[PDB]
Amino acid sequence: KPHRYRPGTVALREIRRYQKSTELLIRKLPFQRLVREIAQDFKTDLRFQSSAVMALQEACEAYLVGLFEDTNLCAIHAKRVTIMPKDIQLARRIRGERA
Amino acid sequence: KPHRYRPGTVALREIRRYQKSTELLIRKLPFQRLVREIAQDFKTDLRFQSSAVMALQEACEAYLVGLFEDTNLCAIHAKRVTIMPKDIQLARRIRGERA
Amino acid sequence: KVLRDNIQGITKPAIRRLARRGGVKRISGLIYEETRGVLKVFLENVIRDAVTYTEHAKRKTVTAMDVVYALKRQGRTLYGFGG
Amino acid sequence: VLRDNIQGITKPAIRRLARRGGVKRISGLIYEETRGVLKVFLENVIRDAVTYTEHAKRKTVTAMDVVYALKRQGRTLYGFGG
Amino acid sequence: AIPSLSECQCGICMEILVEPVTLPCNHTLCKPCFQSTVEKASLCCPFCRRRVSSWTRYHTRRNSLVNVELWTIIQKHYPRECKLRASG
Amino acid sequence: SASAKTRSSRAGLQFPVGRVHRLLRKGNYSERVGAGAPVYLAAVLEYLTAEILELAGNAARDNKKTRIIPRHLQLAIRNDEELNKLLGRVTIAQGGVLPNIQAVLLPKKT
Amino acid sequence: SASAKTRSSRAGLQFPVGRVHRLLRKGNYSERVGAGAPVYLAAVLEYLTAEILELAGNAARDNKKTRIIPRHLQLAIRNDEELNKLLGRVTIAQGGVLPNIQAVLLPKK
Amino acid sequence: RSRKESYSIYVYKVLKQVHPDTGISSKAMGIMNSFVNDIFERIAGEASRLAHYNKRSTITSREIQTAVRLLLPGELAKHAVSEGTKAVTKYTS
Amino acid sequence: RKRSRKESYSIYVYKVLKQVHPDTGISSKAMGIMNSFVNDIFERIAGEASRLAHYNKRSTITSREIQTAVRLLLPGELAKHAVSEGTKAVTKYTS
DNA sequence: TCGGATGTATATATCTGACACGTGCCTGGAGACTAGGGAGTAATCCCCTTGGCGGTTAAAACGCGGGGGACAGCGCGTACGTGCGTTTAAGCGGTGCTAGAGCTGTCTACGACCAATTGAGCGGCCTCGGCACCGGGATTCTCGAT
DNA sequence: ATCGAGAATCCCGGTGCCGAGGCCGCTCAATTGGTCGTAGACAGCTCTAGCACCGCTTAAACGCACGTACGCGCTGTCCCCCGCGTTTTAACCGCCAAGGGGATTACTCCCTAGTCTCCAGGCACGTGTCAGATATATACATCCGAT
Ligand SMILES: [Zn+2]
Ligand SMILES: [Zn+2]
């Protein structure tokens, strides 16, 4: 009889765990590699200082957290608890960046 | 046999009629009176240029038209065709005008 | 010259016409109260901005140019009234 | 030359970010869309930042230009200068 | 009605049509010549002076300015003569 | 161009250059204004105005009218997305909206 | 008050005034700057800074810490109403987010 | 009285240069006047901020170039910078 | 060689913090955030005053310019308190 | 599937007022010359950013059981679109009053500008404690068993 | 309802370490003073549009009755993320290297601010006239109860 939690309770525990915490979420090296991807795409032979990519990560995660707040609101609107594509497209339009 | 349209067809007709047309939609005298109410609530004995009232009313119709686009698609997100208040509060919340 | 509850002056058919321009068919019966409320809040915001512009210039009448300035300050820039 | 790096935004990273947003259940289609919107946001921000840097005849970008690019997008940020 | 190479000469540079692009005025010109007459000029059609700048943006966002049917016809009828201009 | 004519004609533009230079100098943007900035800015304005005017003229002609009205400007701005992206937050007096209805809102084919 | 001292002290303030006056002048906002405008601006800046630091200090004390960190500033800005309305849009680095769970999402028997 | 300063005649001239047949109403003329003023303010403010960022004190041509690149979206910005540089070169020579 | 001069509002924020909470320290990151906040608010108020002065064809940024800009920019109670304390400060300075 | 019923697109007279064009001038724009300082350009230096191992290991991928939740369908009883008669208050017109917006001229207290000056504030170093963290113990939700 | 086992969490203590804060050096930016050209305050004058009123027409709102679309709740089904256990890999920490370009200074020049004179492009003003609003008469697309 192994211990087995019901689905969602540990998810809520780590709701609290990652809201009371402040550390960065996206793994640093792949993220800065993706930033270098975009940079060399737009203009070749570009160099980055650490503070620049750290600020980029700050803004990126803030944007994603806000978008996820909005998508959670949208999902709650449809009497659902599982976020879905259409929630994301609705939020992305409604904030005004796609129209 | 009295003639009665099925519920909805004239609604679409007048949707098209109002979308293709660009006349003013709110009677100017009640809007002017309400604007004067707000003004006298702010400061007493103000005077209104007719162009100023026109600008207020144009801004108001722009705001309501945008908000109604947004709340209509928010309502149809929930598999509905009737816009109820919760659509409006959610749309304003996710737009960010009420926090 | 005080006035009474002219927010009712924004009559039900006005909200209906605005919603029809908004691409809707079916309107909930109690949509009108919060539509009036949001209209009202938008109004005291814009009127506050215009009135404080007017106050700044020793003027006792608000001009349309002040109104469009105020709308521009709210991220709602408007064209067709000068400037 | 390196490519196909959008997958660097891993599964549990997206789960943790959405979870910080108060989301419990995430459908399997969410992650590719999050990658896409993140890619678009990076494209915009990097475009503005590299424009700023190329203007100043600097071939290395700085956090100051990054925060300027954020500000120009109406996305001002605190904690790196300005 | 398939025109000969003389009509296949671009009306400006007197060279053949390579990657043809068709404006709404049915006027066609080569892509190097098209670029030279839009980015280095007043954004006017080289023949009737019409400005299709809006059309230019509209069909360059999707990179669909090229008229594929005419290019296929030309490469079917002049494959080697078009390959002559490929080298530089 | 060594022509000793007005700067608008000397530069081939059609918007004024002296007016723009004065506004830049008196608009309090910098203590010094480069000589090439006003003509460049006038050229940019000329491009944008030409684009919008030709779009509005096409819209009006498609509407069988010979005079651009604010509705035509609204239609030209919204129908294109590039300008609409440039002019997302602006509103036009007596502009109206694009005629469109969401596909779900359309009636069922019975 | 007429005094021969720093203008900040004469105004009874701690923010610089001559520096603020210079940034009004050399910042290219107008060719002439009024004499009392920098004093007013310094007073407003001190008021806002004092209020935000007071809220941050209260939050830090509630967190058993005697030092201000970006998390405390983020909590102070978000929890306040009008400070939120002023700074609701902007994001603070290393600030986390408010502990907020939707009521519907809360567990049920 | 006082003199009023506007771009009405220039907009009319450009319209006739593009559309030699169609006219324009007064309200649309005011729309375009406000539009020109708005873009003027946007680009000028962006250029001033950008010059201040690099500690310069003069709006050269490249300042307006970068401002137009930032403000206008990509492809419109491309055509704008293209014929703006063309016009500057024409003015110089 | 010698390093350039880097302006910051660290000491003034420290002074006001000691005036409010005499025993509370502050970290470097929070100090930088506070400096950036001061810079942002200063830029907003100064820019609003600059446009306002240009609006009425004026040429001077007077105290009334800043007062009206503050009334425009801050929310109600914050604007009222800021206006009151700024009026107190300016009248003390001029007296 | 279909034949009335109805709103919509289309063609023609008409007439009108906003739109397009001639005018004078004047006030802002153009041209010539001067001055001085902002910016470019050479050099250089040293801060830091890219590239590179290499051991560890926390976290990511993968598999699997399953139970919560998405979703389709049924049914209803409500809420709202539709249409018509009523009433009401907007919209237009015309007139009359004048407070205040706009313009002019005058005088001056405010503020730009330059030389001298000295201390406020920032750069660099040193230091003592506030919190990070490991380790342990009591507490505390959470799930199954009735 | 209940009670008990089991992971997870709050609380308490010792160790330590680097960084927040204080002190010294000193360089340059704020201070003070005086002067002078002037934007602005103020007084005065004009006359425009804003305000207020009247009366008339009728467009629109309003209220009621009604029939029907559907919002919501319930039920059942299935399917697919969640939680957990196992395995692997690249993130990561620490160290090391090279060079390259960001940043700094010093010099020179040429590019724009300023001044003045002169002059015509645009604008406030006045005037003709047809593009488009308005009404009436048509045909046509589309709807809906009924076949
Ligand atoms: Zn060619
Ligand atoms: Zn052509």
GROMACS .gro file of N, CA and C in nm, chain F:
model
  330
  452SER      N    1   2.248   6.875  -5.505
  452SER     CA    2   2.163   6.966  -5.581
  452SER      C    3   2.201   7.108  -5.544
  453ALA      N    4   2.255   7.182  -5.641
  453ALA     CA    5   2.304   7.317  -5.617
  453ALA      C    6   2.201   7.425  -5.648
  454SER      N    7   2.077   7.388  -5.679
  454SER     CA    8   1.974   7.486  -5.711
  454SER      C    9   1.951   7.580  -5.593
  455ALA      N   10   1.948   7.710  -5.621
  455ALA     CA   11   1.920   7.811  -5.519
  455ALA      C   12   1.771   7.842  -5.511
  456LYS      N   13   1.691   7.737  -5.496
  456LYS     CA   14   1.546   7.747  -5.486
  456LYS      C   15   1.503   7.712  -5.344
  457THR      N   16   1.372   7.702  -5.323
  457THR     CA   17   1.322   7.659  -5.193
  457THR      C   18   1.365   7.516  -5.166
  458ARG      N   19   1.386   7.485  -5.037
  458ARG     CA   20   1.441   7.355  -5.000
  458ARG      C   21   1.349   7.241  -5.038
  459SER      N   22   1.217   7.264  -5.035
  459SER     CA   23   1.123   7.159  -5.075
  459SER      C   24   1.144   7.120  -5.221
  460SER      N   25   1.160   7.218  -5.309
  460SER     CA   26   1.186   7.187  -5.449
  460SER      C   27   1.329   7.140  -5.470
  461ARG      N   28   1.424   7.199  -5.397
  461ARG     CA   29   1.564   7.161  -5.412
  461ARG      C   30   1.586   7.015  -5.375
  462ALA      N   31   1.512   6.965  -5.277
  462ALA     CA   32   1.525   6.827  -5.233
  462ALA      C   33   1.431   6.732  -5.305
  463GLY      N   34   1.344   6.784  -5.392
  463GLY     CA   35   1.249   6.701  -5.462
  463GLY      C   36   1.126   6.663  -5.383
  464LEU      N   37   1.115   6.709  -5.258
  464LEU     CA   38   1.001   6.679  -5.174
  464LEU      C   39   0.887   6.775  -5.206
  465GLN      N   40   0.776   6.762  -5.134
  465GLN     CA   41   0.659   6.845  -5.159
  465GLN      C   42   0.601   6.904  -5.032
  466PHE      N   43   0.624   6.841  -4.917
  466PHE     CA   44   0.602   6.906  -4.789
  466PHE      C   45   0.709   7.011  -4.762
  467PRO      N   46   0.679   7.111  -4.679
  467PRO     CA   47   0.778   7.216  -4.653
  467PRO      C   48   0.895   7.164  -4.572
  468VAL      N   49   1.008   7.232  -4.586
  468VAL     CA   50   1.128   7.200  -4.509
  468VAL      C   51   1.158   7.307  -4.405
  469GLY      N   52   1.141   7.434  -4.442
  469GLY     CA   53   1.159   7.542  -4.346
  469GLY      C   54   1.063   7.532  -4.229
  470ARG      N   55   0.937   7.496  -4.257
  470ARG     CA   56   0.839   7.480  -4.151
  470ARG      C   57   0.880   7.369  -4.055
  471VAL      N   58   0.924   7.255  -4.110
  471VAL     CA   59   0.966   7.143  -4.027
  471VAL      C   60   1.091   7.179  -3.947
  472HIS      N   61   1.186   7.249  -4.010
  472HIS     CA   62   1.306   7.290  -3.938
  472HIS      C   63   1.272   7.385  -3.824
  473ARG      N   64   1.182   7.480  -3.848
  473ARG     CA   65   1.140   7.571  -3.742
  473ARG      C   66   1.074   7.496  -3.628
  474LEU      N   67   0.983   7.403  -3.662
  474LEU     CA   68   0.913   7.328  -3.558
  474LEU      C   69   1.010   7.243  -3.476
  475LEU      N   70   1.107   7.180  -3.542
  475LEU     CA   71   1.209   7.106  -3.469
  475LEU      C   72   1.290   7.198  -3.378
  476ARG      N   73   1.329   7.315  -3.429
  476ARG     CA   74   1.407   7.408  -3.348
  476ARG      C   75   1.325   7.464  -3.233
  477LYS      N   76   1.199   7.499  -3.258
  477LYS     CA   77   1.114   7.560  -3.157
  477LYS      C   78   1.031   7.458  -3.079
  478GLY      N   79   1.039   7.330  -3.115
  478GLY     CA   80   0.970   7.227  -3.040
  478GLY      C   81   1.043   7.176  -2.918
  479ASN      N   82   1.164   7.226  -2.893
  479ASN     CA   83   1.244   7.188  -2.777
  479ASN      C   84   1.272   7.037  -2.776
  480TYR      N   85   1.338   6.990  -2.882
  480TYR     CA   86   1.380   6.851  -2.889
  480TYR      C   87   1.530   6.837  -2.870
  481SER      N   88   1.608   6.931  -2.922
  481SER     CA   89   1.749   6.941  -2.889
  481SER      C   90   1.795   7.084  -2.913
  482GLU      N   91   1.902   7.122  -2.845
  482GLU     CA   92   1.956   7.256  -2.860
  482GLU      C   93   2.006   7.280  -3.002
  483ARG      N   94   2.051   7.174  -3.069
  483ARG     CA   95   2.100   7.182  -3.206
  483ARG      C   96   2.023   7.084  -3.293
  484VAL      N   97   1.993   7.126  -3.416
  484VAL     CA   98   1.922   7.044  -3.512
  484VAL      C   99   2.009   7.031  -3.637
  485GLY      N  100   2.035   6.907  -3.678
  485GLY     CA  101   2.113   6.885  -3.798
  485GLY      C  102   2.041   6.935  -3.922
  486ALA      N  103   2.120   6.975  -4.022
  486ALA     CA  104   2.064   7.028  -4.145
  486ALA      C  105   1.992   6.923  -4.228
  487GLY      N  106   2.028   6.796  -4.214
  487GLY     CA  107   1.967   6.691  -4.294
  487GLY      C  108   1.846   6.627  -4.229
  488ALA      N  109   1.828   6.650  -4.099
  488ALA     CA  110   1.713   6.593  -4.029
  488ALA      C  111   1.579   6.642  -4.083
  489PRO      N  112   1.554   6.773  -4.099
  489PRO     CA  113   1.419   6.815  -4.141
  489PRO      C  114   1.376   6.758  -4.275
  490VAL      N  115   1.466   6.749  -4.373
  490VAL     CA  116   1.427   6.697  -4.503
  490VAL      C  117   1.398   6.547  -4.494
  491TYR      N  118   1.476   6.474  -4.415
  491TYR     CA  119   1.450   6.332  -4.394
  491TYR      C  120   1.313   6.310  -4.331
  492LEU      N  121   1.282   6.390  -4.228
  492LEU     CA  122   1.153   6.376  -4.162
  492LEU      C  123   1.039   6.414  -4.255
  493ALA      N  124   1.057   6.519  -4.335
  493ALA     CA  125   0.955   6.556  -4.432
  493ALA      C  126   0.934   6.446  -4.534
  494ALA      N  127   1.042   6.378  -4.575
  494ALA     CA  128   1.028   6.266  -4.667
  494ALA      C  129   0.949   6.151  -4.604
  495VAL      N  130   0.977   6.121  -4.477
  495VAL     CA  131   0.904   6.014  -4.409
  495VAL      C  132   0.755   6.049  -4.401
  496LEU      N  133   0.725   6.173  -4.363
  496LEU     CA  134   0.586   6.218  -4.359
  496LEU      C  135   0.522   6.210  -4.496
  497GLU      N  136   0.596   6.246  -4.601
  497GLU     CA  137   0.543   6.239  -4.736
  497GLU      C  138   0.509   6.096  -4.774
  498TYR      N  139   0.597   6.002  -4.741
  498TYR     CA  140   0.567   5.861  -4.766
  498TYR      C  141   0.438   5.818  -4.697
  499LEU      N  142   0.428   5.845  -4.567
  499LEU     CA  143   0.312   5.796  -4.493
  499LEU      C  144   0.183   5.860  -4.544
  500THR      N  145   0.186   5.991  -4.569
  500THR     CA  146   0.069   6.059  -4.622
  500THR      C  147   0.033   6.007  -4.760
  501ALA      N  148   0.132   5.986  -4.847
  501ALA     CA  149   0.102   5.934  -4.980
  501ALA      C  150   0.037   5.797  -4.972
  502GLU      N  151   0.091   5.709  -4.887
  502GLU     CA  152   0.033   5.576  -4.872
  502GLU      C  153  -0.113   5.584  -4.828
  503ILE      N  154  -0.140   5.663  -4.723
  503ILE     CA  155  -0.276   5.667  -4.671
  503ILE      C  156  -0.371   5.735  -4.768
  504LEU      N  157  -0.326   5.842  -4.835
  504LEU     CA  158  -0.411   5.908  -4.933
  504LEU      C  159  -0.444   5.816  -5.050
  505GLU      N  160  -0.347   5.739  -5.099
  505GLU     CA  161  -0.378   5.651  -5.212
  505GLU      C  162  -0.469   5.537  -5.169
  506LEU      N  163  -0.450   5.484  -5.047
  506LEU     CA  164  -0.542   5.382  -4.997
  506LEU      C  165  -0.683   5.438  -4.983
  507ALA      N  166  -0.696   5.559  -4.928
  507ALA     CA  167  -0.827   5.620  -4.912
  507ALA      C  168  -0.892   5.648  -5.047
  508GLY      N  169  -0.813   5.693  -5.144
  508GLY     CA  170  -0.867   5.716  -5.277
  508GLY      C  171  -0.916   5.588  -5.342
  509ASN      N  172  -0.840   5.480  -5.327
  509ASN     CA  173  -0.885   5.351  -5.378
  509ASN      C  174  -1.015   5.308  -5.311
  510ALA      N  175  -1.023   5.324  -5.179
  510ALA     CA  176  -1.145   5.287  -5.107
  510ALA      C  177  -1.264   5.370  -5.154
  511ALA      N  178  -1.244   5.501  -5.171
  511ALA     CA  179  -1.353   5.588  -5.213
  511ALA      C  180  -1.398   5.556  -5.355
  512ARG      N  181  -1.303   5.532  -5.446
  512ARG     CA  182  -1.339   5.496  -5.582
  512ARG      C  183  -1.413   5.363  -5.586
  513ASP      N  184  -1.370   5.266  -5.505
  513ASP     CA  185  -1.443   5.141  -5.494
  513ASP      C  186  -1.583   5.163  -5.437
  514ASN      N  187  -1.602   5.271  -5.361
  514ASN     CA  188  -1.733   5.310  -5.312
  514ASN      C  189  -1.806   5.402  -5.408
  515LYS      N  190  -1.749   5.427  -5.526
  515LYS     CA  191  -1.810   5.511  -5.629
  515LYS      C  192  -1.833   5.654  -5.578
  516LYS      N  193  -1.732   5.709  -5.511
  516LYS     CA  194  -1.734   5.847  -5.465
  516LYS      C  195  -1.604   5.914  -5.505
  517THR      N  196  -1.611   6.046  -5.526
  517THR     CA  197  -1.498   6.124  -5.574
  517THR      C  198  -1.444   6.219  -5.468
  518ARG      N  199  -1.465   6.188  -5.341
  518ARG     CA  200  -1.417   6.274  -5.233
  518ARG      C  201  -1.396   6.189  -5.109
  519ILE      N  202  -1.273   6.186  -5.057
  519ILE     CA  203  -1.241   6.106  -4.940
  519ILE      C  204  -1.311   6.165  -4.818
  520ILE      N  205  -1.377   6.079  -4.742
  520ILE     CA  206  -1.445   6.118  -4.618
  520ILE      C  207  -1.378   6.042  -4.504
  521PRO      N  208  -1.401   6.084  -4.379
  521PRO     CA  209  -1.339   6.012  -4.266
  521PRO      C  210  -1.367   5.863  -4.264
  522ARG      N  211  -1.485   5.820  -4.309
  522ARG     CA  212  -1.513   5.677  -4.318
  522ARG      C  213  -1.415   5.608  -4.413
  523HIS      N  214  -1.381   5.673  -4.524
  523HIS     CA  215  -1.284   5.616  -4.617
  523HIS      C  216  -1.148   5.602  -4.551
  524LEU      N  217  -1.106   5.702  -4.473
  524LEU     CA  218  -0.979   5.692  -4.402
  524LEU      C  219  -0.981   5.579  -4.301
  525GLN      N  220  -1.091   5.565  -4.226
  525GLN     CA  221  -1.103   5.455  -4.131
  525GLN      C  222  -1.094   5.321  -4.201
  526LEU      N  223  -1.164   5.306  -4.314
  526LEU     CA  224  -1.161   5.181  -4.388
  526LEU      C  225  -1.022   5.151  -4.441
  527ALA      N  226  -0.953   5.253  -4.492
  527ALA     CA  227  -0.818   5.232  -4.543
  527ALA      C  228  -0.722   5.191  -4.432
  528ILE      N  229  -0.734   5.253  -4.315
  528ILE     CA  230  -0.644   5.222  -4.205
  528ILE      C  231  -0.670   5.082  -4.151
  529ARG      N  232  -0.797   5.047  -4.132
  529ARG     CA  233  -0.828   4.918  -4.070
  529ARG      C  234  -0.813   4.802  -4.167
  530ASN      N  235  -0.846   4.821  -4.295
  530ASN     CA  236  -0.838   4.712  -4.391
  530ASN      C  237  -0.694   4.662  -4.404
  531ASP      N  238  -0.599   4.754  -4.416
  531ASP     CA  239  -0.459   4.718  -4.403
  531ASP      C  240  -0.426   4.691  -4.257
  532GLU      N  241  -0.334   4.597  -4.235
  532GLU     CA  242  -0.290   4.565  -4.100
  532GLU      C  243  -0.159   4.632  -4.063
  533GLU      N  244  -0.077   4.665  -4.163
  533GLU     CA  245   0.051   4.730  -4.136
  533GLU      C  246   0.028   4.869  -4.076
  534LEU      N  247  -0.054   4.950  -4.142
  534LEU     CA  248  -0.093   5.079  -4.086
  534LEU      C  249  -0.173   5.060  -3.958
  535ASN      N  250  -0.264   4.962  -3.956
  535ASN     CA  251  -0.341   4.935  -3.836
  535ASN      C  252  -0.250   4.900  -3.719
  536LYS      N  253  -0.143   4.824  -3.745
  536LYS     CA  254  -0.044   4.801  -3.642
  536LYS      C  255   0.024   4.931  -3.601
  537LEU      N  256   0.051   5.019  -3.698
  537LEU     CA  257   0.107   5.149  -3.664
  537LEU      C  258   0.006   5.236  -3.590
  538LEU      N  259  -0.122   5.224  -3.621
  538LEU     CA  260  -0.227   5.310  -3.567
  538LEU      C  261  -0.327   5.230  -3.483
  539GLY      N  262  -0.276   5.142  -3.397
  539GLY     CA  263  -0.365   5.056  -3.320
  539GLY      C  264  -0.452   5.132  -3.221
  540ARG      N  265  -0.393   5.228  -3.150
  540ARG     CA  266  -0.461   5.293  -3.038
  540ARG      C  267  -0.542   5.415  -3.078
  541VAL      N  268  -0.532   5.461  -3.203
  541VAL     CA  269  -0.595   5.586  -3.243
  541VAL      C  270  -0.741   5.560  -3.280
  542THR      N  271  -0.823   5.664  -3.271
  542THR     CA  272  -0.962   5.662  -3.316
  542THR      C  273  -0.986   5.780  -3.409
  543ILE      N  274  -1.081   5.764  -3.501
  543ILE     CA  275  -1.112   5.865  -3.601
  543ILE      C  276  -1.257   5.907  -3.585
  544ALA      N  277  -1.280   6.038  -3.579
  544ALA     CA  278  -1.416   6.090  -3.568
  544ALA      C  279  -1.498   6.051  -3.690
  545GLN      N  280  -1.621   6.003  -3.664
  545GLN     CA  281  -1.708   5.950  -3.769
  545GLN      C  282  -1.636   5.845  -3.853
  546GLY      N  283  -1.562   5.758  -3.787
  546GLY     CA  284  -1.485   5.657  -3.856
  546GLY      C  285  -1.561   5.529  -3.883
  547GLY      N  286  -1.634   5.480  -3.783
  547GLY     CA  287  -1.700   5.352  -3.797
  547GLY      C  288  -1.602   5.236  -3.779
  548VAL      N  289  -1.653   5.117  -3.808
  548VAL     CA  290  -1.578   4.993  -3.791
  548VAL      C  291  -1.587   4.911  -3.918
  549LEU      N  292  -1.496   4.815  -3.931
  549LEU     CA  293  -1.499   4.723  -4.043
  549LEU      C  294  -1.625   4.638  -4.036
  550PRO      N  295  -1.696   4.618  -4.147
  550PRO     CA  296  -1.813   4.529  -4.144
  550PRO      C  297  -1.771   4.384  -4.134
  551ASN      N  298  -1.786   4.325  -4.015
  551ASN     CA  299  -1.752   4.185  -3.995
  551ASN      C  300  -1.834   4.129  -3.880
  552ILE      N  301  -1.860   3.998  -3.888
  552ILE     CA  302  -1.934   3.925  -3.786
  552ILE      C  303  -1.861   3.794  -3.761
  553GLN      N  304  -1.848   3.757  -3.634
  553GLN     CA  305  -1.778   3.634  -3.599
  553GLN      C  306  -1.852   3.514  -3.656
  554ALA      N  307  -1.775   3.415  -3.704
  554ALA     CA  308  -1.834   3.305  -3.780
  554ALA      C  309  -1.937   3.228  -3.699
  555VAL      N  310  -1.916   3.213  -3.568
  555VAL     CA  311  -2.015   3.147  -3.484
  555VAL      C  312  -2.145   3.226  -3.482
  556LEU      N  313  -2.134   3.359  -3.481
  556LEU     CA  314  -2.252   3.445  -3.478
  556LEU      C  315  -2.338   3.430  -3.603
  557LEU      N  316  -2.280   3.383  -3.714
  557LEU     CA  317  -2.356   3.365  -3.837
  557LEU      C  318  -2.459   3.254  -3.820
  558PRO      N  319  -2.573   3.263  -3.889
  558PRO     CA  320  -2.678   3.162  -3.872
  558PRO      C  321  -2.642   3.031  -3.940
  559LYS      N  322  -2.702   2.923  -3.889
  559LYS     CA  323  -2.676   2.790  -3.942
  559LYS      C  324  -2.740   2.773  -4.080
  560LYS      N  325  -2.671   2.703  -4.169
  560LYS     CA  326  -2.725   2.673  -4.301
  560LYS      C  327  -2.825   2.559  -4.290
  561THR      N  328  -2.953   2.593  -4.275
  561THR     CA  329  -3.058   2.492  -4.261
  561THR      C  330  -3.137   2.478  -4.390
   0.00000   0.00000   0.00000
